[PDB]
């Protein structure tokens with residue numbers, strides 16, 4: 168996975184991943200998608216279509232105005248859709264799971280899927296379920312979607328306090344200062360604009376952030392276009408750093424968020440344990456529980472489990488880039504899997520996969536990546552209570 | 562450079578470019594000459610036998626000559642700290658002076674200990690001379706010898722550990738990993754004619770010996786490369802075997818039942834003590850330094866539980882993914898605890914491994930800065946975990 172791929176952050180595409188378990192517990196962000204709003208593509212368009220009128224585009228400028236006009240037609244009626252690469256990212260995840268754990272899904276295995284009400288959550292579910300059903304049509308499948316799992320998969324919109332922190336919160340003054348410190352527009356304008364001076368300093372940054380925006384998502388759409396040549400590997404690096412810091416402060420352990428963005432996910436960590444505990448006892452015959460949602464679900468959820476490095480509390484804004492990497496945690500199609508195993512002697516082992524790679528918890532095990540479930544369920548129970556007590560503050 | 566990392570614990574120290582009141586340090590000595598003529602001897606005898614039999618390739622002969630010259634260049638040098646060794650210490654020292662000059666200012670007192678092995682006495686000397694160069698007013702105490710065996714050479718004093726290290730149950734595991742990972746005849750096709758006449762046992766002993774020679778040459782300051790003797794895939798495969806061996810006999814592999822790690826608690830206990838004394842006012846050192854060996858740093862780091870450096874990996878083919886000896890014990894590998902005293906007078910501590918902030922499985926709100934109380938408590942827990950481990954042996 169290349170540096171420029173990584174600098175896409177949460178817009179990065181899901182990377183390459185070319186005994187038996189008895190239960191699998193899963194949460195997945197939808198795969199590669201289209202841009203969700205024409206906001207960025209329009210700021211770019213109206214600036215460039217201004218300069219052209221005034222006869223003030225560079226040659227590369229008309230180049231960019233071309234593509235942009237193209238991408239406008241290629242994005243028509245597609246806003247928010249999951250992309251063909253998303254369909255593929257999900258079929259691969261599920262395909263791999265089925266090759267890895269065939270016994271788990273053989274015969275009349277019962278599985279269960281939930282998704283938010285959001286069309287591309289549901290298109291993910293369907294992508295996932297199709298592969299499984301075509302590999303084994305004798306699966307038993309419960310499929311469901313809707314506002315009802317909002318408290319589980321969109322808790323980040325139900326918490327009045329978080330909502331307020333996120334809109335007019337304290338991380339904002341730190342993010343704006345960081346953007347001005349890390350991103351100089353004036354070297355990027357004159358690439359496309361004759362006389363970039365008469366553009367306001369504020370509008371220049373509005374334009375250059377929209378431009379990074381348009382470029383960064385472009386690889387997730389499966390369109391042959393590609394605008395990474397727009398920027399030097401260092402512009403992409405500085406830009407990534409302002410967004411890695413935005414994801415981190417609005418959405419994870421940034422000490423400015425006082426743990427509030429992480430705590431709001433305990434309803435989901437709890438359904439995760441419920442789901443499992445029900446299978447380990449017998450109030451559920453489910454081989455699997457799949458859940459499809461969003462980056463805003465995954466990020467706080469991953470931090471609340473305390474998967475190593477994701478819970479890090481870092482006080483210097485420029486250090487965060489070193490210890491917290493959002494393309495590590497929440498690429499496109501980012502997924503958490505718990506795989507439960509019952510060994511000879513009847514003891515339970517859980518293995519946690521972040522994006523199909525073994526995760527570490529700050530609890531012991533003489534059998535890594537396999538942790539004792541007793542230990543784990545207790546550890547997570549510590550985290551949940553420790554989140555309810557931060558939310559009590561609010 | 563991936564080739565550099567595959568030297569494993571022979572990889573030269575990587576590139577490294579408010580104020581604490583105390584530094585607690587432990588350093589592996591710098592890049593050194595090979596400590597034994599044994600790999601060089603094996604290689605030579607095999608190619609001398611080849612050429613006495615007309616079994617040598619063109620490149621075969623060019624390796625024989627190379628090997629002969631190296632035997633002359635290693636005469637009397639076995640084990641000595643190399644010029645690059647002196648330098649990397651000067652670096653580590655230089656960088657800690659500049660980052661923390663208030664701590665070494667005025668007549669700061671610093672204490673340095675080394676083990677009786679000359680290469681780690683020279684390492685000390687190089688570190689310390691830079692420190693005195695920059696501030697001659699430093700109060701310096703410098704000692705070394707068998708007196709420190711209990712904390713710098715514990716991998717020799719434990720009777721159970723030595724048995725394990727020489728005939729323990731990691732040996733078959735290792736010997737079969739090398740059998741699967743290392744495929745000789747593609748590597749000796751380059752140096753010998755009819756390389757498939759060589760018995761598999763001797764074929765591996767020579768390719769092992771010959772890797773081991775090209776692994777160390779970059780530490781000797783001898784302007785003579787040898788990575789192109791092996792493809793990058795042979796270096797990988799070879800690194801994995803050496804990485805398994807180091808992990809399994811020196812660190813926290815299940816096969817070893819934490820015994821390779823437990824034997825390091827005297828070192829950890831004394832770190833905390835030297836820090837409690839400075840913190841209490843009993844001592845008033847600015848810094849303690851200690852110069853030992855990878856066999857010291859490996860188990861000491863794992864015993865601290867620095868992140869993933871003590872994973873206990875069930876399956877041997879997975880060890881390279883989760884535990885990398887070149888990240889832990891490069892040449893002149895080192896651990897620093899820097900102690901800070903904030904405005905409420907609480908004591909923070911930041912742990913550096915090879916000069917980069919390490920993570921403890923405890924929690925903190927101002928990472929990399931851990932609460933000392935929380936950290937002292939956690940370490941003492943490990944130290945009692947290791948004592949319980951050593952009472953079952």
Ligand SMILES: O=P(O)(O)O[C@@H]1[C@@H](OP(=O)(O)O)[C@H](OP(=O)(O)O)[C@@H](O)[C@@H](OP(=O)(O)O)[C@H]1OP(=O)(O)O
Pocket residue numbers: 177178196197200203204285460461462463
């Ligand atoms: O791609 P996602 O769904 O995992 O995260 C989106 C986020 O989506 P949503 O869950 O609030 O509908 C928001 O989308 P909208 O409110 O515009 O519908 C965010 O705005 C969007 O950020 P963006 O509009 O700058 O692309 C999130 O994607 P992100 O987490 O990569 O920033």
Ligand SMILES: O=P(O)(O)O[C@@H]1[C@@H](OP(=O)(O)O)[C@H](OP(=O)(O)O)[C@@H](O)[C@@H](OP(=O)(O)O)[C@H]1OP(=O)(O)O
Pocket residue numbers: 173492495566885888
């Ligand atoms: O922190 P690690 O060493 O356990 O994993 C690194 C990875 O290191 P390596 O084992 O290939 O030397 C690479 O490091 P470099 O080749 O840049 O020296 C990866 O690039 C690095 O990803 P990053 O550059 O985005 O930090 C790995 O860290 P990661 O597993 O947290 O992504």
Ligand SMILES: O=P(O)(O)O[C@@H]1[C@@H](OP(=O)(O)O)[C@H](OP(=O)(O)O)[C@@H](O)[C@@H](OP(=O)(O)O)[C@H]1OP(=O)(O)O
Pocket residue numbers: 570571589590596597678853854855856
């Ligand atoms: O390089 P070090 O000193 O930090 O560790 C050595 C180890 O040396 P020592 O601590 O027992 O004196 C052993 O050396 P000797 O008993 O031959 O003096 C090991 O044999 C040596 O391994 P090697 O013979 O394959 O070079 C250790 O270095 P290593 O940790 O890179 O393997």
